[PDB]
Design a protein around this ligand. Structure first.
Ligand code: CLA
Ligand code: CLA
Ligand code: CLA
Ligand code: CLA
Ligand code: CLA
Ligand code: CLA
Ligand code: CLA
Ligand SMILES: CCCCCCCCCCCCCCCCCC(=O)OC[C@H](CO[C@@H]1O[C@H](CO)[C@H](O)[C@H](O)[C@H]1O)OC(=O)CCCCCCCCCCCCCCCCC
Ligand SMILES: CC(=O)O[C@H]1CC(C)(C)C(=C=C/C(C)=C/C=C/C(C)=C/C=C/C=C(C)/C=C/C=C(\C)C(=O)C[C@@]23O[C@]2(C)C[C@@H](O)CC3(C)C)[C@](C)(O)C1
Ligand SMILES: CC(=O)O[C@H]1CC(C)(C)C(=C=C/C(C)=C/C=C/C(C)=C/C=C/C=C(C)/C=C/C=C(\C)C(=O)C[C@@]23O[C@]2(C)C[C@@H](O)CC3(C)C)[C@](C)(O)C1
Lengths: 162, 179, 180, 41, 89, 63
């Protein structure tokens, strides 16, 4: 496949990693009696470990000669779950914070003491604003084609140079 | 305060219990609208059933009898397996198509208030009190819209309904009267 | 008669794409002016009216047309029909491409900047009124056939988008699964 | 107690409560849906 | 003297020989140059493909190389023609 | 020019508040003063100073 990689369910070296990770925890398990808390903890760890290899095998990830999963970010839609889909997710949450935080500064600006409300949050007002950023791509778009997103060039102070 | 009832005899009965105590005048309209819808539907159904029973299908009346056009669904085979067991032989594609037209009509009866669709509203025009009067305005080459026409239409509606219900029942199981 | 009969008699610009380039001072001439957007819409429409009719006239069987110039290559689908024709007929393909290249270059060579409202021509006005039409017709008809050309351009652009989507997403437009 | 409420609205107290709620948000999701390298789950 | 304002540059930028010339001649010349460049490239490619003509760099020919050099000339001439047309020439 | 209470924009380039807005407080009527206009601001500069004197050709009026 891409870059001469093989899928992880068919990699001979990915399977060896699964065995040696389980063998290491089994040889630690043998020094304890079967009902005790260290034996139940290591038994639960080998279940977590065994479920970690099974998950990847059917995942659809690509392995190398090293036996480790690789990620593809060319833009292929077949490997979307690797970068695109968690990427769109992060953009939604990061742009949500920046939008909401900016709404707050603009709101408390027209006031006697704007600086007072940055060290001591008006929580009822802040709480209201935080959840209005769920539709930010629409709200950031309405202000771009209004004139309320970016200011004019005669409103920004500039260094003597330019 | 509704429209004309039975011509031979009249009886409103179950009408003041909802258009005065339970509901109001808005419910009256709605009820009439529903009645008219059902009536028309029943009429069309009746005609279809009649045609099917008679024999005037594509094979008898035109040069084309191949409905499926890929699923090998001829009209002869559908006309030899009754009316109730024929609707189930209709290809999914066709079913989808039919659902489309009806959906469109219903939507129109819902959005396009009077002459044109309404762009801004809390709810659809027909979803409000007295949203659907019953008349869609579809009057191509309209001959008349008098006080007699409406009554006649209504009568034909209920009659049609009863007729088709009876027909279905008889195809399915022993009815009562002759056909 | 107005061009807006299907959107309520008002200019359909949701997403305000004509107002951009004027909303802010921040990209100086990086979005197209009204004159450039008007020629792009006419040009995309005229290429779509020809291309839809092309894929419709060469489709064999089905509803189809199956009409075929004698001597040209028989190809079933429109998706590969260019590259077959490009390899087999170099002289005819090169003369069509040169004709398109000159006429499309002449469109802008005599007039000013289009991207900025500095063109001095009406958008869509290529010197192809050979029939002498609009010199014989009156102003109500001439303004009317412009709107006729526009909406038929617009119906064909949506058609070409359907024709693209059915081959990239196999269940996209369902009215063509059946229609073939 | 309107002065304790203004004390609970000061920026470092709100920052630790917000972070405590948000670290524990991520810890809880990693407790039920662990080892999610990607969407494959 | 070289600096210019407005939509199009003055005729003097083209040079002493070019400014005197009419737009039509320049456009025709540019088209001819383009034709020569493409034909030469195609011929060179054919020679490269051909057996017994490509050994020890035999495919390279002086005339084809001249046409290849001529592609840039075709671009410049067309630009000059546009400028000439703009200056009402 | 401005009056008392007018909102102006600073046009001095080496000022901290170039292209920035603020409020006229006092205009010295005596024209021997080169910079007759006290203009106050709500944000401080790097030396934590809140006001400055200006000439009439260095301030613009907003509305
Ligand atoms: C460390 C990583 C990290 C992560 C993962 C997050 C994650 C999040 N932050 Mg945080 N944050 C962080 C660090 C982080 N933050 C840091 C370092 C700071 C600086 C101090 C902040 C500052 C901060 C602020 C101020 C805010 C956030 C908010 C948010 C949330 C925005 C998205 C959301 O509310 O849910 C997604 C919600 C939806 C997708 C709902 C969709 C919209 C509804 C209408 C659809 C309804 C669908 C329906 C219910 C489905 C049911 C149907 C049924 C049939 C199934 C999100 C949980 C915001 C928040 O908490 O929201 C109130 C917020 O205001 N963050
Ligand atoms: C399905 C049937 C159907 C019908 C008949 C119509 C008809 C109409 N549409 Mg709608 N439309 C439909 C479905 C339909 N639409 C669907 C499915 C959509 C997408 C969801 C739309 C989206 C839509 C938009 C966005 C717009 C319209 C517009 C219009 C009207 C043209 C504008 C105007 O000024 O006329 C007004 C008509 C008159 C002044 C004459 C009145 C005479 C009456 C009887 C109407 C004619 C009879 C009736 C239409 C027939 C329907 C009966 C049915 C059994 C066939 C026209 C009445 C435009 C509009 O109305 O607003 C400006 C408009 O902007 N349509
Ligand atoms: C779904 C169709 C439908 C609807 C909505 C109506 C609605 C209405 N009819 Mg009506 N009608 C129908 C079918 C329908 N009818 C049929 C088939 C006949 C022929 C027998 C009649 C004959 C009839 C007469 C003779 C008159 C009306 C009248 C009226 C109006 C006042 C009566 C009332 O309050 O509702 C009636 C009650 C209901 C709609 C309740 C619904 C029934 C329940 C939920 C289920 C019943 C199932 C039933 C077992 C089906 C078998 C049929 C039955 C005969 C055994 C009202 C608008 C009167 C009118 O216009 O105002 C004076 C009037 O004069 N109708
Ligand atoms: C002018 C529009 C138009 C066109 C070109 C077609 C074309 C087609 N219809 Mg049709 N159809 C139309 C309008 C149209 N229909 C309308 C308005 C209705 C009523 C809602 C139907 C109801 C209909 C049915 C019920 C069926 C078709 C079927 C078919 C297709 C045969 C498929 C092989 C054929 C391509 C048949 C089909 O899809 O078979 C697979 C089929 O069974 N159509
Ligand atoms: C006995 C049946 C009957 C009667 C009296 C009416 C009467 C009326 N309908 Mg109507 N309708 C009917 C059946 C009927 N309809 C059916 C079955 C349907 C469903 C398809 C409809 C659907 C319908 C709509 C969608 C609308 C009306 C409307 C109207 C009113 C005025 C406009 C109009 O079309 O006049 C109809 C004129 C006549 C019925 C007289 C002519 C005689 C008929 C056509 C003979 C029919 C024979 C046969 C079915 C036709 C096939 C030809 C065959 C002989 C070869 C009017 C009161 C409009 C309305 O409510 O506005 C107020 C409206 O919007 N109707
Ligand atoms: C738009 C003009 C145009 C273009 C681009 C071409 C291009 C081509 N023709 Mg063609 N041709 C044209 C017009 C054109 N022709 C006309 C008007 C005729 C007469 C009717 C012919 C007759 C003709 C014949 C008879 C044959 C070709 C062949 C070829 C191919 C050359 C061989 C090869 O592999 O390419 C070599 C690579 C290149 C040409 C690319 C070089 C591009 C460089 C970067 C310079 C740019 C070109 C130039 C300066 C710009 C043109 C300006 C123009 C818009 C005014 C090539 C694809 C031959 C072939 O192999 O068939 C497939 C062949 O047999 N053509
Ligand atoms: C950057 C190169 C370049 C430049 C500056 C020009 C400039 C001009 N061309 Mg020309 N042209 C070019 C490339 C170029 N051309 C190419 C590649 C072809 C195809 C072979 C043509 C074919 C052509 C025709 C047929 C005609 C012109 C005409 C003209 C003149 C005005 C009308 C016009 O621009 O529309 C033409 C617009 C285009 C060709 C758009 C394509 C531009 C190129 C391909 C984009 C690449 C630029 C990119 C940003 C550079 C990045 C820098 C670096 C990374 C390489 C003008 C002097 C006309 C003329 O003579 O004046 C009356 C005319 O009729 N051109
Ligand atoms: C290279 C360019 C050479 C041009 C010569 C000089 C041109 C000139 O001086 O003025 C240029 C003239 C045009 O004159 C234009 O007038 C303008 C008016 O503002 C300008 O002022 C310029 O004078 C000029 O641009 O060119 C022509 O009119 C004729 C073009 C020459 C044709 C060359 C193409 C040949 C096509 C093949 C024909 C084959 C037909 C035979 C088939 C039959 C059987 C086989
Ligand atoms: C479906 C199908 O099968 O159909 C076929 C046939 C069809 C449609 C024909 C096909 C085609 C080929 C096409 C479309 C070819 C297009 C060719 C094209 C577009 C050629 C423009 C030349 C412009 C010139 C010379 C301009 C001169 C301009 C002149 C001379 C002026 O001075 C104009 C002047 O204006 C001023 C400035 C001011 C006015 O006061 C005065 C006048 C008016 C004098 C297809 C694609 O093959 C399909
Ligand atoms: C009488 C009259 O009126 O005539 C009319 C006729 C007509 C047609 C109507 C008119 C017109 C329009 C015209 C003439 C339009 C012309 C357009 C034209 C001719 C556009 C060329 C572009 C060339 C380029 C981009 C070259 C690139 C060349 C490149 C990128 C290279 O690097 C070449 C090169 O790399 C090779 C390949 C390899 C090496 O071996 C050599 C080197 C490394 C250098 C006019 C103007 O109205 C006049």
């Amino acid at each position: 496949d891409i870059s001469g990689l093989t899928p992880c369910k068919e990699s001979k070296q990915f399977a060896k990693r699964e065995k040696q990770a389980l063998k290491k925890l089994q040889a630690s398990l043998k020094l304890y009696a079967d009902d005790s808390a260290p034996a139940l903890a290591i038994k639960a760890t080998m279940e977590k470990t065994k479920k970690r290899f099974d998950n990847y095998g059917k995942y659809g990830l690509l392995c190398g000669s090293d036996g480790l999963p690789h990620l593809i970010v060319s833009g292929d839609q077949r490997h979307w779950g690797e970068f695109i889909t968690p990427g769109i997710l992060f953009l939604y949450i990061a742009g949500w914070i920046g939008w909401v935080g900016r709404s707050y500064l603009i709101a408390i600006r027209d006031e006697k003491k704007p600086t007072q409300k940055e060290i001591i949050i008006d929580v009822p007002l802040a709480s209201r604003l935080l959840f209005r950023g769920f539709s930010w791509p629409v709200a950031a778009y309405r202000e771009l084609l209004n004139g309320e997103l970016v200011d004019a060039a005669a409103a920004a102070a500039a260094a003597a140079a330019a | 305060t509704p429209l004309g009832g039975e011509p031979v005899f009249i009886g409103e009965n179950y009408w003041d219990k909802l258009t005065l105590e339970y509901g109001s005048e808005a419910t009256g309209t709605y009820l009439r609208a529903a009645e008219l819808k059902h009536g028309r539907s029943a009429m069309l159904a009746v005609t279809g059933f009649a045609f099917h029973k008679l024999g005037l299908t594509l094979n008898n009346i035109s040069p084309h009898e191949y409905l499926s056009i890929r699923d090998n669904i001829k009209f002869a085979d559908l006309a030899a397996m009754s009316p109730i067991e024929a609707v189930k032989h209709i290809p999914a594609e066709g079913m989808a198509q039919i659902f489309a037209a009806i959906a469109a009509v219903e939507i129109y009866e819902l959005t396009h208030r009077n002459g044109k669709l309404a762009y801004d509203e809390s709810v659809a025009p027909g979803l409000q009190p007295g949203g659907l009067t019953g008349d869609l305005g579809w009057n191509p080459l309209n001959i008349k819209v008098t006080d007699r026409r409406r009554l006649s239409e209504l009568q034909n509606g209920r009659a049609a309904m009863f007729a088709i219900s009876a027909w279905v029942a008889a195809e399915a199981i022993p009815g009562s009267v002759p056909i | 008669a107005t061009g807006f009969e299907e959107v309520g008699g008002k200019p359909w610009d949701p997403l305000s794409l004509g107002k951009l380039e004027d909303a802010n001072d921040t990209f100086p001439n990086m979005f197209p002016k009204s004159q450039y957007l008007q020629e792009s819409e006419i040009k995309h429409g005229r290429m779509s009216m020809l291309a839809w009719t092309g894929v419709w006239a060469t489709h064999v069987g089905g509803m189809g047309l199956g009409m075929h110039i004698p001597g040209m290559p028989v190809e079933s689908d429109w998706t590969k029909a260019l590259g077959v024709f490009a390899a087999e007929q170099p002289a005819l393909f090169g003369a069509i491409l040169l004709f398109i290249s000159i006429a499309e270059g002449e469109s802008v060579g005599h007039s000013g900047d289009n991207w900025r409202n500095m063109s001095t021509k009406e958008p869509g006005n290529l010197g192809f009124d050979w029939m002498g039409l609009t010199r014989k017709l009156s102003e109500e008809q001439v303004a009317r056939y412009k709107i006729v050309e526009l909406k038929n351009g617009r119906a064909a652009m949506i058609a070409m988008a359907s024709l693209f989507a059915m081959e990239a997403i196999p269940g996209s437009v369902p009215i063509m699964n059946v229609f073939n | 107690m309107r002065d304790l409420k203004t004390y609970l609205s000061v920026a470092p107290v709100a920052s630790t409560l917000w972070f405590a709620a948000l670290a524990g948000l991520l810890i809880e999701i990693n407790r039920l849906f662990p080892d999610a390298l990607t969407f494959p789950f | 003297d070289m600096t210019w304002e407005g939509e199009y540059p003055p005729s003097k930028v083209l040079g002493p020989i070019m400014s005197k010339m009419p737009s039509g001649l320049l456009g025709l010349i540019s088209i001819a140059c383009a034709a020569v460049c493409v034909y030469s490239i195609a011929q060179s490619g054919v020679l490269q493909q051909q057996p017994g003509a490509y050994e020890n760099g035999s495919w390279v020919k002086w005339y084809y190389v001249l046409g290849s050099f001529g592609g840039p000339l075709a671009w410049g001439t067309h630009v000059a023609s546009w400028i000439q047309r703009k200056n009402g020439m | 020019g401005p009056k008392r209470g007018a909102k102006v924009k600073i046009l001095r380039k080496e000022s901290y508040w170039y292209k920035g807005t603020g409020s006229v407080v006092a205009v010295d009527q005596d024209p021997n003063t080169r910079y007759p206009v006290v203009v106050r601001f709500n944000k401080v500069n790097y030396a934590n100073v809140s006001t400055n004197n200006y000439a009439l050709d260095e301030i613009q009026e907003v509305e």
